[PDB]
Write a protein that binds this ligand. Structure first.
Ligand code: HEM
Ligand code: HEM
Ligand code: HEM
Ligand code: HEM
Lengths: 146, 141, 141, 146
């Protein structure tokens, strides 16, 4: 990432206001709903048949909180994402077999979710800093693929 | 293709945009310029400064075209033919940029329509913007 | 939209492929796995090793469907419905990958049909694979 | 880029067999033909109305060799394509207004041309290494865009 200091502060201020539990559930559900193909990985989660079925599925909510948990950690090591995400990268590749393009889709969904949540507070320039950040994370998560 | 559900979602959300379409179009351009700087290569002739009248003027134009696609949701390919011709033959915008704008259009609506921007409406708006993009790029080759 | 020249071009080119389509299927897959290692995420159950019977077998299958599409260049949507089905609802391959296999298929054709891989044929084949791609990812949502 | 000595050798040796003049004129013309919108930057070149007209245009041909030339000089700095292409990156941004996405198209066109030319010699493993270089070059060229 190429985060100016003022971008780094704006990322962090806002992130301070986020309820990772909820945002996490929202981003993951929205991903499964907007890009139905990403459902391939959660066939054991049950019913993902309709939007209410996904958004309210306790398994989706739980997972989402896990994912965003790992993401917030990443936000504290913005200096060493590849480092921070190495073991997870290996897992996604080698055990899970998740196509890394899925990580960029999640990034975009999350940026819509933050826009959804903060309204006007999510200014043009705050989004530019977050774009850099989600791109960074997706890259980090894909770094170990082979 | 857009389902009846999708069409209802889009008309409803765009319905709410109403008279702000102009301002929301301008906003989507600004976000796009800031987040995906590579898109600026297409507007070398524009004052891209904050609150450029050029951008404002340009945003209305875009918004007006989207409003026109919603109005003709069952005949987009024809309702948009002109603009397809323009983008393919004169402007020659590379395809990938369309997805960048779509994404910022999505961001703007989310930021302004908290109540209407449900998972279902989000999915519908995404498919819609993808279809518009497909039309504008249909005459490329 | 394939023009009459395009369909001709495509038909010509594939015509020369002939008894080798299977081999070219296989080779393209091999080139994709090597060049875009992320594509391997969709074949965890295959032996991706050089000259694996699984890859060969699969290469055939892909070649044959391509063949079938050249034959129904005019009615693609209809000729590949099952395949559009399979990929959309069963396989759920992400759309980006279709561009990766397409490219590897060009490369393979380039490497084996020196004389027939003119700039005009190259453009036609590209548009063809794109069309096949669109068809195969049309029921995604 | 992140080329293995083995991969470094394969790139290096195939290249040594490259007639820059021909490959360059052909990479650039195929680009203008396969992806017609790239012609917006060569209005002044003339008649690009037909494959035959692009392939024949000497302005096109001579631009192609100037492009492959710089590309060629870059394979000598695989350890720093960024510093090698910095000024060219500023130029493409600031003076030419060329969308970096075009860098990627060219790259792919380039790989198709090498295959075209080297048939058998251009094996899956050799293409793999060239794919990493074209990505590498495209990335370095886009590096100074703002
Ligand atoms: C921000 C990007 C992501 C982060 C930080 C992240 C993080 C995590 C974490 C911490 C786990 C649990 C690890 C374990 O079980 O040992 C996990 C599991 C998993 N992730 Fe990711 N993830 C991300 C994106 C995605 C996406 C986009 C997909 C699929 C579209 C995905 C698919 C999975 C699956 C299928 C599992 C295992 C679920 C199970 O327990 O069955 N992840 N992820
Ligand atoms: C869904 C997406 C899009 C819509 C609805 C749209 C619509 C329009 C409209 C209505 C105009 C004005 C034409 C006139 O003067 O009547 C225009 C012009 C233009 N558009 Fe698009 N467009 C879209 C995507 C894009 C993208 C993605 C780019 C580049 C990133 C782009 C670049 C341009 C340029 C450079 C002009 C001409 C500006 C000028 O000099 O005034 N367009 N577009
Ligand atoms: C050029 C476009 C493509 C065509 C014509 C095509 C065609 C086919 C065919 C004919 C089959 C076999 C169906 C059967 O067994 O009856 C198949 C299966 C499959 N395809 Fe596609 N395919 C294409 C693109 C892709 C891409 C890009 C990917 C992934 C990156 C992919 C992944 C798969 C997988 C994983 C299978 C099942 C493999 C197995 O378990 O045997 N396909 N495809
Ligand atoms: C491998 C990628 C590329 C390299 C190494 C490269 C390199 C060069 C070089 C060395 C010049 C010389 C101009 C000068 O020094 O003033 C040049 C000019 C130029 N390039 Fe690139 N280029 C690349 C890709 C592209 C692409 C893909 C396009 C458009 C599709 C493009 C458009 C131009 C234009 C319009 C000029 C100016 C030519 C003129 O003055 O007539 N370049 N490039």
């Amino acid at each position: 990432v190429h985060l100016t200091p003022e971008e780094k502060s704006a990322v962090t201020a806002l992130w301070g206001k986020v309820n990772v539990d909820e945002v996490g559930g929202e981003a993951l559900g929205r991903l499964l709903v907007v890009y139905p193909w990403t459902q391939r990985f959660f066939e054991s989660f049950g019913d993902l048949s309709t939007p209410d079925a996904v958004m309210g599925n306790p398994k989706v909510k739980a997972h989402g909180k896990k994912v965003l948990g790992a993401f917030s950690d990443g936000l504290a090591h913005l200096d060493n994402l590849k480092g921070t995400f190495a073991t997870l990268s290996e897992l996604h590749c080698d055990k899970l077999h998740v196509d890394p393009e899925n990580f960029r889709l999640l990034g975009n969904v999350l940026v819509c979710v933050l826009a959804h949540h903060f309204g006007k507070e999510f200014t043009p320039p705050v989004q530019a800093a977050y774009q850099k950040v989600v791109a960074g994370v997706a890259n980090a998560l894909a770094h170990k693929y082979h | 293709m857009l389902s009846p559900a999708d069409k209802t979602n889009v008309k409803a959300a765009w319905g709410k945009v109403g008279a702000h379409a102009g301002e929301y179009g301008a906003e989507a351009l600004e976000r796009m310029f800031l987040s995906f700087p590579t898109t600026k290569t297409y507007f070398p002739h524009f004052d891209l400064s904050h609150g450029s009248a050029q951008v404002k003027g340009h945003g209305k134009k875009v918004a007006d075209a989207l409003t026109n696609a919603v109005a003709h949701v069952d005949d987009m390919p024809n309702a948009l033919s002109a603009l397809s011709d323009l983008h393919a033959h004169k402007l020659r915008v590379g395809p990938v940029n369309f997805k960048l704008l779509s994404h910022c259009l999505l961001v703007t609506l989310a930021a302004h329509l908290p109540a209407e921007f449900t998972p279902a409406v989000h999915a519908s708006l995404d498919k819609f913007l993808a279809s518009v993009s497909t039309v504008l790029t249909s005459k490329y080759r």
